[PDB]
């Protein structure tokens, strides 16, 4: 599914993303754009390194959730990567949240880093309502 932005906006605020370890719904809502465009079915496998980024978030299958395919993986959001493509972002959001709870914060996407961090990220959540 391709979320429009607002109703993106909205979903994540019902989910309990406003704020979630310290990060503000507007941060939320410049990694989604970045890292999938707002696409529930998004995939990118890494030649690299046999892994590959699942969802609205791209999730990696290396530490995050199993396809089964990849080396000397771990499943720390105890899901199945199949369950970061499906139009219900309930999943993905919860695995996010485990994500963010690590070292980094935030800062464990490299997207963010790139186009978020630092900028005036505002422009993702005006005129939503939230």
Same mark, same amino acid.
């Given at each position: ?16 993303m406003?704020?979630?370890?310290g ?66 972002? *309930?999943?993905?959001?919860? =695995?996010?949240? &485990?994500? %963010? $709870? ?8 490299? *997207?963010?880093?790139?186009? =978020?961090?630092? &900028?005036? %990220? $505002? ?8």
């Open positions: 599914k391709v979320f429009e932005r607002c109703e993106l906006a909205r979903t994540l605020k019902r989910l309990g406003d704020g979630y370890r990060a503000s719904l507007a941060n939320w809502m410049c990694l989604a754009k970045w890292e999938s465009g707002y696409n529930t079915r998004a995939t990118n496998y890494n030649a690299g390194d046999r892994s590959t980024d699942y969802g609205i978030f791209q999730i990696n299958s290396r530490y995050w959730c199993n396809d089964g395919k990849t080396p000397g993986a771990v499943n720390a959001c105890h899901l199945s990567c199949s369950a970061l493509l499906q139009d219900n972002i *309930a999943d993905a959001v919860a =695995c996010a949240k &485990r994500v %963010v $709870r690590d070292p980094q914060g935030i800062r464990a996407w490299v *997207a963010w880093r790139n186009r =978020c961090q630092n &900028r005036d %990220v $505002r422009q993702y959540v005006q005129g939503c309502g939230v």
